[PDB]
Design a protein around this ligand. Structure first.
Ligand SMILES: CC(=O)NC[C@H]1CN(c2ccc(N3CCOCC3)c(F)c2)C(=O)O1
Ligand SMILES: CC(=O)NC[C@H]1CN(c2ccc(N3CCOCC3)c(F)c2)C(=O)O1
Lengths: 190, 190
């Protein structure tokens, strides 16, 4: 039962590494999962729903890793370890990341899923900036929530350009340092 | 001759304010332009080609405005006036901007057009950062081209989220100040 669904999900993630979702059929997904097409539709209403579940797993993986960091005890290193959660989680799931990004234009559930977790991560970013200002380590410059929004959107666009190998992009081996520098200077700079 | 093409372009930009390109037909474009459908196809092979021409006009408008600034004579104000070129140009063409962004996923000519001008604007950003470092006004921190890439991708994503009213986004009345702060602190901060 659970294994057939997992088999579908594993096949989809494996097939997404070689071609986009538009070049993958339900028959492809069923074959790689060792099931029939009617059996597929018992577990998922569409191949788009399979992607939604894959993306949901990846964004929740990143969210739970951030929560783990948040519950635990320099300033540059604090932000680097946190940004790294997203660099490593989405970089370990590049095919799903890329396909989920492109799905936002056509899937309201995917758009709402991405929007929901971006709001959460921006609010937590803003809370950390506020706490940094409260203790006197960061200056009171921009409204923290607007600063947090821009920095998070930067990371979204820059990480996914690097993972997709877009032209232009920051080389993947340089993107962590690049983002950390911009976060640290814009949060602590006066 | 030239007027019929211009009439097609004006109709498309006007129709794109109320609905996406997928909800606009060649018959819509021909009717608003006061021509027949075969006459439309004399001027453009598809409605996607009409969008390409519209976007080409907008990115060249922004590029030429930047060139005008570049040929002419504080540091925060220098970057603000330059970022404003893109805020005003694309903000005066929000429907085309939005439709052209979404077209990158399906149109190679649109993707290459956006990629071409982003490379140009990143290289010019990097050259200004370098000149700022050469004269001693900016510290030698990140490689200037990688810094320039991240900042330009930030502006792309943040401007277009604000113009589209996405959730999350920086309010349009705050996005110029937000971006200028992040550019200035990350270029001049040590
Ligand atoms: C005190 C502490 O633990 N600091 C670590 C920071 C990291 N971080 C954060 C949030 C969202 C993101 N992003 C970037 C990538 O995509 C979306 C969200 C991010 F990179 C980093 C945050 O608030 O905690
Ligand atoms: C000395 C001088 O004239 N400085 C003004 C700066 C502004 N600027 C620049 C380039 C690309 C962008 N963007 C952001 C929006 O989308 C893509 C490119 C930008 F905002 C700003 C640049 O190099 O000149």
């Amino acid at each position: 039962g659970d294994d057939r669904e997992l088999a579908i999900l594993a096949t989809a993630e494996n097939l997404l590494e070689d071609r986009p979702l538009a070049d993958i059929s339900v028959d492809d997904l069923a074959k790689g999962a060792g099931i029939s097409r009617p059996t597929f539709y018992f577990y998922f209403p569409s191949k788009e729903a399979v992607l939604l579940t894959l993306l949901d797993r990846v964004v929740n993986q990143a969210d739970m890793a951030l929560q783990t960091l948040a519950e635990n005890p320099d300033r540059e290193n604090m932000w680097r370890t946190g940004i790294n959660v997203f660099f490593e989680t989405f970089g370990s799931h590049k095919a799903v990341t890329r396909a989920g990004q492109a799905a936002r234009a056509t899937s309201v559930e995917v758009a709402e899923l991405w929007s929901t977790f971006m709001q959460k991560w921006i609010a937590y970013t803003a809370a950390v900036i506020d706490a940094e200002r409260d203790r006197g380590a960061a200056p009171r410059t921009l409204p923290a929530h607007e600063l947090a929004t821009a920095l998070n959107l930067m990371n979204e666009r820059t990480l996914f350009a690097s993972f997709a190998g877009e032209q232009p992009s920051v080389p993947e081996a340089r993107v962590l340092d690049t983002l950390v520098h911009i976060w640290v200077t814009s949060i602590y700079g006066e």
